[PDB]
Amino acid sequence: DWPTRQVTLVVPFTSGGTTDMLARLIAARLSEHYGQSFVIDNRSGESGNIAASYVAKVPADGYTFIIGTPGIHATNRLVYRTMGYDPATDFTPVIVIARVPNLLSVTKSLPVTSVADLISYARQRPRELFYGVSALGSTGHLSTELFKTMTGVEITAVPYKGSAPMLRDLAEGRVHLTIDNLPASKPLLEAGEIRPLAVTTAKRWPPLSHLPTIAEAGVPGYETASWFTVGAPRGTPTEIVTSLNTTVAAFLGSDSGTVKLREIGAEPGGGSPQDMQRHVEAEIARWEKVAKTAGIAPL
Numbered sequence: 397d398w399p400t401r402q403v404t405l406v407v408p409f410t411s412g413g414t415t416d417m418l419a420r421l422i423a424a425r426l427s428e429h430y431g432q433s434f435v436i437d438n439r440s441g442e443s444g445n446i447a448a449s450y451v452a453k454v455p456a457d458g459y460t461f462i463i464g465t466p467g468i469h470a471t472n473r474l475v476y477r478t479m480g481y482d483p484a485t486d487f488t489p490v491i492v493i494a495r496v497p498n499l500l501s502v503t504k505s506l507p508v509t510s511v512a513d514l515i516s517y518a519r520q521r522p523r524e525l526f527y528g529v530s531a532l533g534s535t536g537h538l539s540t541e542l543f544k545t546m547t548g549v550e551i552t553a554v555p556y557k558g559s560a561p562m563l564r565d566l567a568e569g570r571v572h573l574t575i576d577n578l579p580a581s582k583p584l585l586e587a588g589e590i591r592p593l594a595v596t597t598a599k600r601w602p603p604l605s606h607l608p609t610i611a612e613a614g615v616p617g618y619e620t621a622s623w624f625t626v627g628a629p630r631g632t633p634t635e636i637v638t639s640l641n642t643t644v645a646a647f648l649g650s651d652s653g654t655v656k657l658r659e660i661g662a663e664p665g666g667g668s669p670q671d672m673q674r675h676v677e678a679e680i681a682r683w684e685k686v687a688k689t690a691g692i693a694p695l
């Protein structure tokens with residue numbers, strides 16, 4: 397009979413970031429399919445640790461899910477000593493929603509138009525400039541620290557509570573540049589409020605096919621990306637996980653769903669619950685190496 401009443405999707409960041417943008421798309425589609433409201437609960441704090449600690453404790457009845465992030469599943473262990481939950485044991489996978497490029501951008505008043513211009517400008521002014529971090533341990537955060545190690549540039553991190561307040565400060569010039577998820581940055585690109593330099597992925601993003609990759613623009617072998625999930629509390633009934641996976645997978649694999657995701661700067665995910673588990677395990681192992689190379693660890 398599930399669902400017989402309202403379902404909550406817990407989202408670990410405020411609105412105007414990529415996590416909430418994908419959650420709203422999913423919530424609308426699930427609501428229509430099942431005839432019950434799927435509502436969003438924006439529960440910010442500690443790079444998603446407060447949200448994840450909460451969902452780890454709720455009843456495993458199918459009326460609460462987590463919209464997971466690389467932090468919650470893989471990277472927060474690199475910057476936080478204690479987290480309030482154990483991502484390996486406390487959840488059961490549902491599906492990977494999307495794989496998403498990150499984007500290097502600068503504030504308009506910084507007089508640089510390419511990755512090579514940025515590296516020169518910063519090498520001339522070591523330890524003077526500032527960059528925006530959407531959250532401690534985010535793929536943006538670790539992407540910039542890897543870029544720093546691979547190019548020799550010295551620039552100072554300023555953490556924020558999500559992409560939304562960070563990007564407001566980048567538009568004002570209170571930070572000079574960022575690497576962060578494409579969907580959140582794209583409306584600012586299109587309003588001309590920030591200047592895009594390059595994508596972080598191994599291949600160009602086709603709908604912005606004339607922005608180069610960081611690797612082709614001067615940093616050989618550089619590759620990073622972000623991603624987003626639906627997770628359930630340990631013990632959620634198999635029938636419920638399977639139904640929810642099937643419904644989301646149908647949306648993501650549809651022509652119309654693929655178009656909707658790509659228009660906002662995201663590639664559809666899809667696959668099985670165990671495919672999500674494989675992606676999480678690979679990412680744990682790959683980011684732990686990046687963190688060591690870049691000199692990042694928990695205080």
Ligand SMILES: O=C(O)CCCC(=O)C(=O)O
Pocket residue numbers: 409410412413414415416465466467530531533534535536557558559560577622623
């Ligand atoms: O790439 C990541 O680690 C996810 C960062 C998500 C975010 O900052 C937001 O939704 O506001």
